[PDB]
Amino acid sequence: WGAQGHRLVAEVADARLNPTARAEVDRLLATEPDATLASIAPWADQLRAKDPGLGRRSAGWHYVNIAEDNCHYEAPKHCRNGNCIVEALKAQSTILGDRSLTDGERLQALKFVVHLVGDIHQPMHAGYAHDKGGNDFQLQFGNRGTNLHSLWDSGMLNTRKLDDAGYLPLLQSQRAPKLARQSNPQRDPQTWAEASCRISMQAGVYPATRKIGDEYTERYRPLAEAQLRLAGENLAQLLNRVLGARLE
Ligand SMILES: Nc1ccn([C@@H]2O[C@H](COP(=O)(O)O)[C@@H](O)[C@H]2O)c(=O)n1
Ligand SMILES: [Zn+2]
Ligand SMILES: [Zn+2]
Ligand SMILES: [Zn+2]
């Protein structure tokens, strides 16, 4: 997603935190003055843009292109050295849950987990290697050029012309999505990447015309918005599992 989609995922999640996970999240955020779950949600994209070390190393962690394999993820094929969103989200979830680590180390893992639960729910982040997740699929949206990747990251969301205070209660108003009964931090990333890939392959998501506008927005903006709400509920369930339990 763009920066607003990332913040909205975090905002949906923050409201659903159990008291134990909320206390631990606030403890980690407090190590970075005035940080919130929303303000850190875009951080991994600015790290990618600005840090020639970890930023360059982590660029692959934002996606996994599995549509040419009909949305059947296989790590040795799509992800050999672990540089894809499925393996990165698994590892950063393990690091976040590691109570032996410093609050600074665990905040860094929280920043990756908040971002990548957002990205793994963006259909074009699990799409075709051929066109780099739609980045190479140029199209005209209204009287402006864009690409299919950007259209899903932010183009359709921007048509609401809402700041987060306007957009968040619209996402919260939707019918509740059906979640898995429990978070499995090691298995759910693959399930989520596959589900996002199946949306990228749905009839009409790749349009049959170079020029699109209101009809595309009317059909697919609700799907993008359903995916933000789903991402937020899935992020809260993950944080509630990873940070929410200690007894026994
Ligand atoms: N042409 C582009 C495309 C994306 N971007 C950045 O990448 C972000 C999206 O990253 P993800 O695809 O990982 O979500 C945008 O919010 C923006 O900051 C950019 O800065 N210039
Ligand atoms: Zn994103
Ligand atoms: Zn993107
Ligand atoms: Zn990203």
Short mmCIF file of C-alpha atoms and ligand atoms in Angstrom, two decimals:
data_model
loop_
_atom_site.label_atom_id
_atom_site.label_comp_id
_atom_site.label_asym_id
_atom_site.label_seq_id
_atom_site.Cartn_x
_atom_site.Cartn_y
_atom_site.Cartn_z
CA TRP A 1 0.00 0.00 0.00
CA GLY A 2 0.88 3.71 0.00
CA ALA A 3 1.50 5.49 3.33
CA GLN A 4 -2.26 6.00 4.06
CA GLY A 5 -3.15 2.28 3.46
CA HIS A 6 -0.26 1.29 5.87
CA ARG A 7 -1.48 3.74 8.62
CA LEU A 8 -5.14 2.52 8.20
CA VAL A 9 -4.08 -1.14 8.65
CA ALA A 10 -2.22 -0.09 11.90
CA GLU A 11 -5.22 2.05 13.06
CA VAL A 12 -7.71 -0.85 12.54
CA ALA A 13 -5.28 -3.18 14.41
CA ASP A 14 -4.47 -0.83 17.35
CA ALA A 15 -8.20 -0.73 18.43
CA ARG A 16 -8.35 -4.62 18.59
CA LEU A 17 -5.22 -5.17 20.74
CA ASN A 18 -5.79 -7.18 23.99
CA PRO A 19 -4.54 -5.36 27.14
CA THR A 20 -1.30 -7.50 27.33
CA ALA A 21 -0.34 -6.88 23.64
CA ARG A 22 -1.37 -3.15 23.92
CA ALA A 23 0.96 -2.69 26.99
CA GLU A 24 3.91 -4.44 25.21
CA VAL A 25 3.35 -2.49 21.92
CA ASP A 26 3.26 0.83 23.91
CA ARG A 27 6.50 -0.21 25.78
CA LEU A 28 8.28 -0.81 22.44
CA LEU A 29 6.88 2.44 20.88
CA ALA A 30 7.94 4.45 24.00
CA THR A 31 11.67 3.75 23.12
CA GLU A 32 11.09 6.09 20.09
CA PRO A 33 9.51 9.33 21.33
CA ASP A 34 6.06 10.18 19.77
CA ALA A 35 6.06 6.92 17.64
CA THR A 36 2.57 5.32 17.27
CA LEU A 37 1.51 2.06 15.57
CA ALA A 38 0.20 4.29 12.70
CA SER A 39 3.36 6.50 12.38
CA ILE A 40 5.74 3.46 12.08
CA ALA A 41 3.44 1.63 9.56
CA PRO A 42 5.08 3.25 6.41
CA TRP A 43 8.63 3.14 7.87
CA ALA A 44 9.86 0.03 5.92
CA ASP A 45 9.14 1.88 2.57
CA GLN A 46 11.20 4.94 3.68
CA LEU A 47 13.95 2.49 4.86
CA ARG A 48 13.87 0.96 1.33
CA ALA A 49 14.10 4.45 -0.29
CA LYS A 50 16.79 6.04 2.01
CA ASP A 51 19.08 3.25 3.50
CA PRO A 52 21.61 1.87 0.93
CA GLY A 53 22.33 -1.05 3.35
CA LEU A 54 19.33 -2.76 5.09
CA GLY A 55 16.95 -0.72 2.81
CA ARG A 56 18.42 -2.30 -0.37
CA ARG A 57 18.71 -5.78 1.36
CA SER A 58 15.01 -5.62 2.53
CA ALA A 59 13.37 -4.43 -0.81
CA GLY A 60 12.43 -8.06 -1.74
CA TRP A 61 10.70 -8.46 1.71
CA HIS A 62 7.69 -6.31 0.52
CA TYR A 63 6.33 -8.86 -2.01
CA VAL A 64 6.37 -12.38 -3.45
CA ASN A 65 5.46 -12.97 -7.10
CA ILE A 66 3.60 -16.33 -7.32
CA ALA A 67 0.81 -15.72 -9.95
CA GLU A 68 2.76 -17.60 -12.75
CA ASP A 69 2.58 -20.66 -10.37
CA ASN A 70 -1.24 -20.21 -9.91
CA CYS A 71 -0.66 -18.74 -6.39
CA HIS A 72 1.15 -21.91 -5.09
CA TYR A 73 4.03 -20.58 -2.95
CA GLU A 74 7.27 -22.72 -2.68
CA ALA A 75 10.19 -21.16 -0.64
CA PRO A 76 13.12 -22.77 -2.56
CA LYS A 77 11.48 -21.45 -5.83
CA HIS A 78 10.10 -17.99 -4.93
CA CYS A 79 12.34 -17.14 -1.92
CA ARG A 80 15.64 -19.21 -1.69
CA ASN A 81 17.62 -16.86 0.66
CA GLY A 82 14.42 -15.77 2.47
CA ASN A 83 14.21 -12.36 0.69
CA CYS A 84 10.37 -12.35 0.18
CA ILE A 85 7.36 -11.22 2.23
CA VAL A 86 6.34 -14.78 3.38
CA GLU A 87 9.73 -15.62 4.93
CA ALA A 88 10.44 -12.04 6.13
CA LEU A 89 7.04 -11.80 7.96
CA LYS A 90 7.64 -15.24 9.62
CA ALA A 91 11.15 -14.24 10.81
CA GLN A 92 10.18 -10.73 12.03
CA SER A 93 7.17 -12.28 13.93
CA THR A 94 9.64 -14.68 15.67
CA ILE A 95 12.04 -11.74 16.49
CA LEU A 96 9.12 -9.58 17.86
CA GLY A 97 8.05 -12.44 20.21
CA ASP A 98 11.66 -12.99 21.50
CA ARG A 99 11.53 -11.57 25.09
CA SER A 100 15.37 -12.07 25.45
CA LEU A 101 15.92 -9.20 22.91
CA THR A 102 16.21 -5.44 23.72
CA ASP A 103 13.15 -3.14 23.32
CA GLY A 104 15.01 -1.42 20.38
CA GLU A 105 15.49 -4.80 18.57
CA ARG A 106 11.80 -5.74 19.14
CA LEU A 107 10.52 -2.27 18.02
CA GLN A 108 12.43 -2.76 14.71
CA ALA A 109 10.67 -6.15 14.23
CA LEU A 110 7.31 -4.47 15.15
CA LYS A 111 7.94 -1.86 12.37
CA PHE A 112 8.50 -4.71 9.82
CA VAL A 113 5.53 -6.80 11.11
CA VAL A 114 3.07 -3.80 10.96
CA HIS A 115 4.26 -2.91 7.40
CA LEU A 116 4.39 -6.47 5.95
CA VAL A 117 0.95 -7.58 7.29
CA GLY A 118 -0.27 -4.51 5.28
CA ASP A 119 1.76 -5.34 2.09
CA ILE A 120 0.92 -9.13 2.13
CA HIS A 121 -2.84 -8.19 1.91
CA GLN A 122 -2.28 -5.93 -1.20
CA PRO A 123 -3.16 -8.26 -4.12
CA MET A 124 -0.45 -6.88 -6.48
CA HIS A 125 2.22 -7.65 -3.79
CA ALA A 126 1.59 -11.41 -4.59
CA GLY A 127 1.11 -11.04 -8.38
CA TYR A 128 3.15 -11.69 -11.56
CA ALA A 129 6.97 -11.65 -11.70
CA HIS A 130 6.49 -10.85 -15.45
CA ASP A 131 5.30 -7.22 -14.89
CA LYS A 132 6.85 -6.81 -11.34
CA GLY A 133 3.50 -6.93 -9.47
CA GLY A 134 1.81 -4.59 -12.01
CA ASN A 135 4.56 -1.92 -11.75
CA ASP A 136 5.30 -2.54 -15.51
CA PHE A 137 1.55 -2.67 -16.32
CA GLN A 138 1.07 0.98 -17.37
CA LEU A 139 -2.57 2.22 -17.86
CA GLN A 140 -4.64 5.46 -17.98
CA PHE A 141 -6.89 6.06 -14.90
CA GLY A 142 -9.20 9.05 -15.61
CA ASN A 143 -7.15 11.75 -17.42
CA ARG A 144 -3.84 10.59 -15.79
CA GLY A 145 -1.22 7.87 -16.47
CA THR A 146 -0.43 5.34 -13.70
CA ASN A 147 0.38 1.61 -13.34
CA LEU A 148 -1.78 -1.30 -11.96
CA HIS A 149 0.56 -1.59 -8.89
CA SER A 150 0.16 2.14 -7.90
CA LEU A 151 -3.59 1.99 -8.71
CA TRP A 152 -3.95 -0.68 -5.95
CA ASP A 153 -1.31 0.80 -3.52
CA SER A 154 -3.03 4.24 -3.48
CA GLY A 155 -4.83 5.36 -6.75
CA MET A 156 -8.27 3.87 -5.86
CA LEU A 157 -7.95 4.72 -2.10
CA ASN A 158 -7.10 8.38 -3.05
CA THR A 159 -10.48 8.67 -4.91
CA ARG A 160 -12.25 8.87 -1.45
CA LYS A 161 -10.32 12.18 -0.76
CA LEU A 162 -10.36 11.26 3.00
CA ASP A 163 -7.67 11.72 5.64
CA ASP A 164 -7.26 8.81 8.11
CA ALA A 165 -9.94 10.27 10.49
CA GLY A 166 -12.44 10.09 7.55
CA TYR A 167 -11.27 6.74 6.14
CA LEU A 168 -10.84 4.68 9.36
CA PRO A 169 -14.56 4.69 10.46
CA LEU A 170 -15.58 3.73 6.87
CA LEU A 171 -13.31 0.60 7.11
CA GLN A 172 -14.67 -0.08 10.66
CA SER A 173 -18.32 0.15 9.32
CA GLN A 174 -17.80 -2.85 6.93
CA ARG A 175 -19.27 -6.28 7.76
CA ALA A 176 -16.72 -8.26 9.88
CA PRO A 177 -14.47 -10.45 7.68
CA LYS A 178 -14.21 -14.21 8.57
CA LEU A 179 -10.73 -14.66 10.20
CA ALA A 180 -8.95 -17.96 10.98
CA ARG A 181 -9.97 -19.04 14.55
CA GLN A 182 -6.30 -18.60 15.71
CA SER A 183 -3.12 -16.83 14.51
CA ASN A 184 -0.31 -19.20 13.38
CA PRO A 185 2.59 -16.79 12.80
CA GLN A 186 4.70 -19.41 10.91
CA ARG A 187 1.91 -20.66 8.54
CA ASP A 188 -0.49 -17.67 7.98
CA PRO A 189 1.95 -15.57 5.83
CA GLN A 190 1.86 -18.24 3.05
CA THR A 191 -1.97 -18.49 3.35
CA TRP A 192 -2.29 -14.65 3.11
CA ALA A 193 0.14 -14.30 0.15
CA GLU A 194 -1.80 -17.06 -1.69
CA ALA A 195 -5.21 -15.34 -0.97
CA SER A 196 -3.85 -11.95 -2.21
CA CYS A 197 -2.43 -13.69 -5.36
CA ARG A 198 -5.89 -15.21 -6.11
CA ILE A 199 -7.36 -11.62 -6.11
CA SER A 200 -4.54 -10.48 -8.54
CA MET A 201 -5.68 -13.35 -10.89
CA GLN A 202 -9.50 -12.60 -10.58
CA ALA A 203 -11.42 -11.80 -13.83
CA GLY A 204 -11.18 -8.04 -14.56
CA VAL A 205 -8.44 -7.10 -12.00
CA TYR A 206 -6.14 -6.95 -15.03
CA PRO A 207 -8.37 -4.81 -17.28
CA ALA A 208 -9.00 -5.60 -21.00
CA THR A 209 -8.61 -1.86 -21.95
CA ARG A 210 -5.59 0.52 -21.51
CA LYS A 211 -8.01 3.34 -20.39
CA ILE A 212 -10.07 2.85 -17.13
CA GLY A 213 -11.87 5.15 -14.61
CA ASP A 214 -15.12 5.14 -12.51
CA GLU A 215 -16.36 1.59 -13.50
CA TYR A 216 -13.02 -0.01 -12.39
CA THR A 217 -13.07 2.08 -9.12
CA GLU A 218 -16.74 1.18 -8.49
CA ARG A 219 -15.94 -2.58 -8.82
CA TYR A 220 -12.47 -2.87 -7.19
CA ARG A 221 -12.17 -0.01 -4.62
CA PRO A 222 -14.53 -2.02 -2.31
CA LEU A 223 -12.10 -5.02 -2.65
CA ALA A 224 -9.05 -2.85 -1.80
CA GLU A 225 -11.05 -1.48 1.20
CA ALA A 226 -12.11 -5.03 2.31
CA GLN A 227 -8.36 -6.01 2.08
CA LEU A 228 -7.33 -2.99 4.36
CA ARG A 229 -9.96 -4.06 6.99
CA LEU A 230 -8.86 -7.75 6.69
CA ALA A 231 -5.15 -6.75 6.96
CA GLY A 232 -5.95 -4.68 10.12
CA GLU A 233 -7.94 -7.53 11.80
CA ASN A 234 -5.18 -10.06 10.83
CA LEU A 235 -2.44 -7.66 12.16
CA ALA A 236 -4.29 -7.37 15.56
CA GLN A 237 -4.78 -11.19 15.78
CA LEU A 238 -1.00 -11.67 15.05
CA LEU A 239 0.11 -9.05 17.62
CA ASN A 240 -2.43 -10.48 20.19
CA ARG A 241 -0.85 -13.98 19.70
CA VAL A 242 2.85 -12.89 19.55
CA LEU A 243 2.71 -10.27 22.38
CA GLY A 244 -0.53 -11.22 24.25
CA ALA A 245 0.46 -14.38 26.25
CA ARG A 246 3.06 -15.30 28.95
CA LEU A 247 1.26 -17.63 31.47
CA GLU A 248 2.46 -21.34 31.47
N1 LIG B 1 7.28 5.59 -8.10
C1 LIG B 1 7.21 5.30 -6.79
C2 LIG B 1 6.49 4.15 -6.34
C3 LIG B 1 6.47 3.92 -5.01
N2 LIG B 1 7.12 4.75 -4.12
C4 LIG B 1 7.04 4.56 -2.67
O1 LIG B 1 6.75 3.20 -2.39
C5 LIG B 1 5.65 3.10 -1.46
C6 LIG B 1 4.92 1.80 -1.69
O2 LIG B 1 5.75 0.69 -1.27
P1 LIG B 1 5.14 -0.75 -1.24
O3 LIG B 1 4.79 -1.10 -2.70
O4 LIG B 1 6.09 -1.66 -0.58
O5 LIG B 1 3.90 -0.66 -0.54
C7 LIG B 1 4.86 4.38 -1.71
O6 LIG B 1 4.22 4.81 -0.52
C8 LIG B 1 5.95 5.41 -2.01
O7 LIG B 1 6.49 5.95 -0.80
C9 LIG B 1 7.81 5.87 -4.58
O8 LIG B 1 8.38 6.60 -3.76
N3 LIG B 1 7.84 6.12 -5.93
ZN ZN B 2 2.70 -0.85 0.91
ZN ZN B 3 3.15 -1.67 -3.38
ZN ZN B 4 6.19 -1.92 1.46
#
